[PDB]
Amino acid sequence: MNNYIFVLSSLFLVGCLGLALKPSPIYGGLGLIVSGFVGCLMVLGFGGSFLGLMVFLIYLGGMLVVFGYTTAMATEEYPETWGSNWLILGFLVLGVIMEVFLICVLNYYDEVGVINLDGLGDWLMYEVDDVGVMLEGGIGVAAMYSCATWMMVVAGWSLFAGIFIIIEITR
Amino acid sequence: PFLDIQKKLGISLDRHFMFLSAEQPYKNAARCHAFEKEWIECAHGIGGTRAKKECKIEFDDFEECLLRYKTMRRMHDIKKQREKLMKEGKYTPPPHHSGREEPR
Amino acid sequence: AGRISAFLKNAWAKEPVLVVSFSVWGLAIIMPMISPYTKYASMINKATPYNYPVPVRDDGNMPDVPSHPQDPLGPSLDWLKNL
Amino acid sequence: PGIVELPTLEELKVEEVKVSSAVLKAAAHHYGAQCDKTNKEFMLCRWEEKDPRRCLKEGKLVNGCALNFFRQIKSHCAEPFTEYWTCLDYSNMQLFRHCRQQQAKFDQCVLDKL
Amino acid sequence: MNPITLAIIYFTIFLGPVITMSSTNLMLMWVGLEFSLLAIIPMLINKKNPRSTEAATKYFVTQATASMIILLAIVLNYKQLGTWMFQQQTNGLILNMTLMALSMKLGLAPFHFWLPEVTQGIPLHMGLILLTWQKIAPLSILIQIYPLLNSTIILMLAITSIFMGAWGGLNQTQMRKIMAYSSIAHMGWMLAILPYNPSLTLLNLMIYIILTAPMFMALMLNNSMTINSISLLWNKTPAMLTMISLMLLSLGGLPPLTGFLPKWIIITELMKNNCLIMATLMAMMALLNLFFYTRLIYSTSLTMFPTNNNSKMMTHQTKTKPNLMFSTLAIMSTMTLPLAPQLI
Amino acid sequence: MPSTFFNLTMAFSLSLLGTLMFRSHLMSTLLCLEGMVLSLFIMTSVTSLNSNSMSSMPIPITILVFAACEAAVGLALLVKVSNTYGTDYVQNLNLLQC
Amino acid sequence: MFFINILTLLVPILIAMAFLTLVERKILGYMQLRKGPNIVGPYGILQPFADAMKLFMKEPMRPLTTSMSLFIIAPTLSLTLALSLWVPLPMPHPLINLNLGILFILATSSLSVYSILWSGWASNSKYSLFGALRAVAQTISYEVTMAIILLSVLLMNGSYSLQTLITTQEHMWLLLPAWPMAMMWFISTLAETNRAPFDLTEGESELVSGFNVEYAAGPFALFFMAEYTNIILMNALTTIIFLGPLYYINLPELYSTNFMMEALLLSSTFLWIRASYPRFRYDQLMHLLWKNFLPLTLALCMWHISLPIFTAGVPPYM
Amino acid sequence: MWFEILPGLAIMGVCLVIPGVSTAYIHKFTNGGKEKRVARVQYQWYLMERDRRISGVNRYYVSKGLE
Amino acid sequence: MNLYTVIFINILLSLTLILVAFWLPQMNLYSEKANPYECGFDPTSSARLPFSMKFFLVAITFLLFDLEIALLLPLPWAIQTIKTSTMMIMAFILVTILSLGLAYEWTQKGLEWTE
């Protein structure tokens, strides 16, 4: 329980590690739908249920296109991804041993407090709201329409122009 | 800002949520209102290089309202001691720290 | 007219979708401007006490609501009832 | 550098209400009418003085008028009050929208008495 | 291109700096770098050839990574001393990785290998926007951090941009890869004097923009992207040689012309801040930045390369040069040295 | 909170370590550029969600409207890399150095 | 005592789905003037057990050219999700109440795609690559609308919690305010849940058993167990979001009892469709749904924004 | 005739009432005859964790009769 | 925690149902039923070549709108603001520029399956 988010966090670092080794874009895309899901857990492990689901709505319909084009532009006769060579599988297993190494190194140097495996799980929320109402996220994201209505025009204009910026690149 | 066309027009385009203690959505607070306020009403009209040496009490505190680090070593030195003290004993935890209490 | 008003007639026979969309678009922004009840949306939404109303302290001033809630002074919304 | 100066375990000992939320929501609107001068002054200390340990005594009266509020329920008009929250706590969010018949039955019992 | 697409993309370009300017948050100030990153790519690719695509990819992938390395330093700063500004007591590697990323947006030390490759394989219009207008918003990150830059690495990125923008400009016959390495040379002057009175880097930018814009617009006039093509200009428009002799001997700073002014009063600010040994290494290499202008004005002006007879038709068909944009920007430079106190 | 951000900063870096070492695909580098964004979404949300800085909670979406609009312009160039070559290999575009 | 609730939540939907395989063969039959199963049981009540127990004895094809890891995970991922969407689905009081109990649906509804993409991509075959690609441009088509047709309804409701609609529908069905939404929702409940008049993905006649052709019996059932399990959700939602049955909280089994009566119609309404209409050729479906529904959606999306503020009808955030 | 369909429906029709009517009777058994008492906000959780602390650790009980 | 009790199950209900499908059919896998299908012949090409889609531009307009959809989703809470006149306008401005962005593409032949 106390070791909840350190697990969700290290399974994210790994979901972004194999993502960095650059297998075929499918098993990288799979490597991001996972880490995007895992991102919905820790964002939600610290409160707001909205923001986590968003990543887990964008980068589903995001990676649904990444499945489409890779079948048309980015794909070999043989994908040759993870269980296909030993150059990736070494630096996929020695990245994880480097992880268990490194985090276990600097709990010995428990002076900067970058990780405190003994003082773990006890510092995650920091005095939230206990008696309270109308506090969740989505009240903040809805400031696009009150008191932060410039985040709104500036991002809407990007999508108004993306629709024109994109076709002149195809044409 | 360079080409500051916000003060020239007066309007707050986006300079009203740069920091934590800045008009939260309905009426909430941003967990360090008391300290950032005391830091930034201090560093007004004294700007910059002299907000860095004399208004250091307010940042050293706001650097610990926010990071909240020294409370960890002050709360990890406890465990390190008790985990050492017990395991060779000399400490019997009370009821209200091992479970059973009278909640209120 | 005829050269504009009868163009809508085929655009209502064929293409009978954009006419609704372009209508409901033009029929959405226009109605709050000619309503009797649009004033209340920013008022029914301003009455909700989500946060606690901090009381002031009496210093010989502000002949408002005294230290009694059911006292006829103050924002007594009898408009929400009997809307 | 400094120490934190705060009460002792006996300086904040009070007769607890020891009462649940559902029954407490029921008698709330009357708890706003009565026991208001004794509760707002706590808040007026609480928001003006930003410290639990400088607004301590006023709290003891918040939990002293509420008792004198329920003591007047326990003697006068207790049974119809039990019939009220006993249905209200059946819901999953304690809505007044359902227990609206026992509400007047308790309000007329308390409009006449007290 | 369709005007409803042109105006939108000529306007996002007008938002990138202007939102990087009129915004204190380092998030509004971030997106401004992206409006200037989305909008450019549709006009890099107007011909859709194997030269425009490779530049845009080499302009996009090289420059979105920088927008992330920037955005890290905000979030790393949104945690420490929670706000949206590099306040005063932010950590170093937050900013030395910010300045890192800006140097990729601009192209300085080894971050220059994308600029000429992109400034090559591109029209001359849209060669002028990168080197002049895309360059203003990154600096608007970088004047706002007026103090509190590492004086050590801000200065190796200068010298490395004097060398690599001078050694490299010798080889290159294509004018577009020359002007790329001029931008890199002159940025070591914009960028070394950033802690040291950066009312002088706002200067060296407004000078440099007045030098290039006539030049790139002097190459639009005949679409000459080669020394051997700017050479045969005495037969097409010989009236232009009088400026380019000065536009280049100024853009490589010689005193009676204004393009020595920034190279000069900068050094004063360097000498006056007790770095007597750095400014020399620059100024000894700004002379090498004349050799491929001395050599270039020879091939252009002071020796008539052997032209073509097919060019005899060009002496019939009455071109039209712009107005208020060249005559101004070539006399408002190269003849404004005596007004230096008004500049600074 | 000070166990994930070292672990998320270290997840940004591996993706920065990935989108600088290529493996013969332009479309796996664009792909590695979105998990780069993603660690900044989360390392921005939490900072805006343990601090209860709801006023900054509009920011983790504005960051992300430019995570797909940048990918959109990114994906659309592959259409124009493929239609020259049809293979999408980064080693195939080297005819600018000339 | 919670596992005994899942046990009474998953058994009574895998045992229902099974008899939708039957009911999807008889109702279609009598329209075709042909009795369906009559023999294995009294009236075909015992045919899916044969069909089920038949499929877990045949050789699950491990094809020679494939990716055996994603091969096995897609049916694990399909039967997981569409079964796992019943968790917050509020018969009056749900197993798991959620504030964002409908974004849970949308997001997990989208992961039912990757069971169709990873399958046909793993399985090396042209006739399965297509069916994978046939979902890509299908999700691209409706998913813009399964949100806004679902937002603008939940715009004159408040929170995304599905439990609130039982109180929004305390005196009326939302079918009458929004029949335009309910029309396009019905078709968007029909593109998602690829079972359809426009199937396009398991096309027997074009793409024979698309996304599904290299799969033999063992893994094969987990799609039918997932597809016919998902037919009942996206009708069960219409019996919550648009057709509001009776709450009356002292007999909560009246909600669940009227919840039956309408969900079977909307589950029996899909059955008239498959027996009544052909497919959209896969270029119309995205010309039928970006051109005709998408503008008409944004309009009513805009109308229901100016519906309460025009009048007063602001949903409360309880 | 068509009446042979009703077995497939009315056996499917005694199969989707259970997860609705079982979801309540299983809640009332666990929650003490009350409903599950869902908590969407941070206030309704406080009342629980208060009522959890005015009794034995189960929170579906004690009220007035005390003082 | 209560949901992990629901969903680790459904993995096991799937994972326990798949192990009893590979290890209880009595298989005979040799060579020619494992090899791919193409309707009774040996496939010409290799099944993993560039597909070359034709809806490439619409996939991006979706890729932009999934943001825009996400950029709508806070409206149920935005109506619970005290202003409800910038939320009014700025909700019209977002939906309108979308349809303008959608109608431009609709005329410039974006969603038309290049052919």
Ligand SMILES: CCCCCCCCCCCCCCCCCC(=O)OC[C@H](COP(=O)(O)OCCN)OC(=O)CCCCCCCCCCCCCCCCC
């Ligand atoms: C004062 C102190 C401050 C420091 C002063 C520094 C020195 C001044 C700068 C000198 C550099 C500029 C002069 C060099 C230009 C290059 C040479 C040149 O342009 O002439 C060659 C060119 C030959 O071309 P051709 O085809 O033969 O035509 C000849 C007649 N049409 O001949 C041409 O055709 C070009 C001209 C054709 C159009 C007629 C214009 C005549 C030129 C007028 C400019 C005269 C210089 C200005 C006055 C000096 C400014 C201080």
Ligand SMILES: CCCCCCCCCCCCCCCCCC(=O)OC[C@H](COP(=O)(O)OCCN)OC(=O)CCCCCCCCCCCCCCCCC
């Ligand atoms: C074969 C491959 C299978 C792998 C993929 C499986 C996909 C599973 C389906 C995806 C789930 C959709 C996203 C769920 C997000 C959580 C939904 C939510 O927002 O509500 C969570 C809820 C708290 O939210 P809320 O109720 O609104 O807060 C107010 C308090 N009532 O209550 C909570 O806080 C609970 C939140 C955590 C629940 C996450 C469930 C994770 C299940 C484990 C997945 C990994 C599988 C295990 C490993 C096996 C190996 C494969």
